[PDB]
Amino acid sequence: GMLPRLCCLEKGPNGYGFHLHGEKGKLGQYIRLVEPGSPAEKAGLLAGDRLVEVNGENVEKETHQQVVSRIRAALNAVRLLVVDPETSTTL
Ligand SMILES: [Cl-]
Ligand SMILES: [Cl-]
Ligand SMILES: [Cl-]
């Protein structure tokens, strides 16, 4: 499809089941290590995705800690707007 994928996760007993990682001296958070059978896997999340929005807010210019805080403060449901970095660029 033309729109970025929107992954809608409901928190489970072992969390969401994915890792979030940022680079050295550069903004942008990426998905890593999507656990098999997790809410992240069921929602369509894939390691290698770049995270663009959390619950309708753009997180491309925020620090790693700011993005983690947004995810954790949410009431156990997150909508993650993600893109494939190989084909997608922010300008
Ligand atoms: Cl990680
Ligand atoms: Cl690392
Ligand atoms: Cl990974």
Numbering used by the authors: 9 to 99
The publication says:
Interleukin 8 receptor, beta (CXCR2) is a G-protein-coupled receptor that mediates neutrophil migration to sites of inflammation and controls the positioning of oligodendrocyte precursors in developing spinal cord by arresting their migration. We recently showed that CXCR2 formed a complex with its downstream effector phospholipase C (PLC)-β2 via the scaffold protein Na+/H+ exchanger regulatory factor-1 (NHERF1) in neutrophil-like cell lines and bone marrow-derived neutrophils. Furthermore, we showed that the formation of this complex was mediated by the PDZ domains of NHERF1, which bridged CXCR2 and PLC-β2 by binding to their C-terminal PDZ-binding motifs.
The crystals diffracted to high resolution (1.16 Å), and the structure was determined by molecular replacement. The crystal structure reveals a polymeric PDZ1 arrangement with the carboxyl terminal region TSTTL of one PDZ1 molecule bound to a neighboring PDZ1, which leads to the formation of a linear PDZ1 filament throughout the crystals. The CXCR2 pentapeptide (TSTTL) binds PDZ1 in an extended conformation, forming numerous contacts with β2 and B and burying a total solvent-accessible surface area of 692 Å2. Specifically, the side chain of CXCR2 Leu0 enters a deep hydrophobic pocket composed of invariant residues Tyr24, Phe26, and Leu28 from β2, and Val76 and Ile79 from B. These pocket-forming residues are important for NHERF1 functions; for example, mutation of Tyr24 and Phe26 completely abolished the NHERF1-targets interaction and significantly altered cellular processes essential to tumor metastatic behaviors. In addition, the side chain hydroxyl of Thr-2 hydrogen bonds with the imidazole ring of His72, with its side chain aliphatic carbon making direct hydrophobic contacts to the conserved Val76. In PDZ1-CXCR2, the side chain of His29 is oriented toward the hydroxyl group of Ser-3, participating in specific ligand interaction; whereas in other three complexes, the imidazole ring of His29 points away from the bound ligands and does not engage in any peptide recognition.
